[PDB]
Design a protein around this ligand. Sequence first.
Ligand SMILES: Nc1nc(=O)c2ncn([C@@H]3O[C@H](COP(=O)(O)OP(=O)(O)OP(=O)(O)OP(=O)(O)O)[C@@H](O)[C@H]3O)c2[nH]1
Ligand SMILES: [Mn+2]
Ligand SMILES: [Mn+2]
Length: 269
Amino acid sequence: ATYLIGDVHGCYDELIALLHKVEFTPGKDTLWLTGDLVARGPGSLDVLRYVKSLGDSVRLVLGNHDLHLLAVFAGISRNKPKDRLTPLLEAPDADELLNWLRRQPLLQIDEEKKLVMAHAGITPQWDLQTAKECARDVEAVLSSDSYPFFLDAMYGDMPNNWSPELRGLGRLRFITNAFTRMRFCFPNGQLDMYSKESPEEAPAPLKPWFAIPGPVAEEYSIAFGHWASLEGKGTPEGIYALDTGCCWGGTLTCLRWEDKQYFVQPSNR
Ligand SMILES: Nc1nc(=O)c2ncn([C@@H]3O[C@H](COP(=O)(O)OP(=O)(O)OP(=O)(O)OP(=O)(O)O)[C@@H](O)[C@H]3O)c2[nH]1
Ligand SMILES: [Mn+2]
Ligand SMILES: [Mn+2]
C-alpha cells in the first residue's frame, strides 16, 4: 500500500503511532513524506534516523525547515532554540544523517499513480518538464560538495515570477521558494512571500496557488504539506493538503492512496 504523511516536524511519537495504526510494513508498503521532517517538535533526531533507515520504502521531498537545518549544520545560519535541533546537531551520526538529507529530492513523480509531490506544491507557472528541470538543478547543487554556498544564496524573496530566461542566483532562489515556501499566488501566478493565513482570511487578489489552473494540476494529482493554516481543507479535487499542524497541537494526517482513506493521529502536545 501507499501512504502519504504531512509535515512531521520532529513529532516522532505521533509518526510511529500513525504508521502502527495502518500497520506500515516496509517491503510491502511505501511511505511518501511531504518534508519538514525536523524542527519545533522534540524528536528531529529520531525522525531523521528512522526515515533514512527506510531506504527505497520512503519517497521524501525537502521542505523549508529541512533546508534551514542544513544551513545551520553548515554554519550558514544561526540555530534558533525554539527549533529544538541541538540533539540532532550534536549527535555522533549528525554528519551521516545530514549528508543523506541533502541528497533527497525536492519533487517526487509516480506516473502509474498519476501523482506528484513537493513540499509547497507546484506553481501554476510550471509545466511538468520545467518542474522536473528545476528540481534537478537545485538537487544538483544541494548534493554537491559546495552546498553551503547555495544554502547561503537561497535566502531571499525575489524574483517571484518564473521565466525560462531566469539565470543564476535569482533562478535558484525562485525555484526554492516555489517548491518550499509557496502559498498564495497573484492572478498571473506570481508568488507572494508574506501571507501565511487561510485562503478565507487572505486579502484580494491573492488566491491559493492550487486555485489557479496549471498544466501539472490539470493532468496529475498533487500532494503537498507546508501550509498548516490551510488545515488540510478547502482544496479542489485532485489536490491533497496533508499538513494538519501536528507540531502545533493539531494532528498528523496519513492518506492511503489506493482508497483515498484518511488516518489521523492527535498531537501529544
Ligand atoms: N492562522 C493560522 N491558523 C492555523 O491553524 C495555524 N497553524 C499554524 N499557524 C501559524 O502559521 C505559521 C506558519 O507555519 P506553518 O504553516 O507550519 O509553515 P512552516 O513551513 O512550518 O513555516 P513558515 O515560516 O510559515 O513557512 P514559509 O516561511 O516557507 O512560508 C506559524 O508561525 C504558525 O504559528 C496558523 N495560523
Ligand atoms: Mn512545516
Ligand atoms: Mn514548510
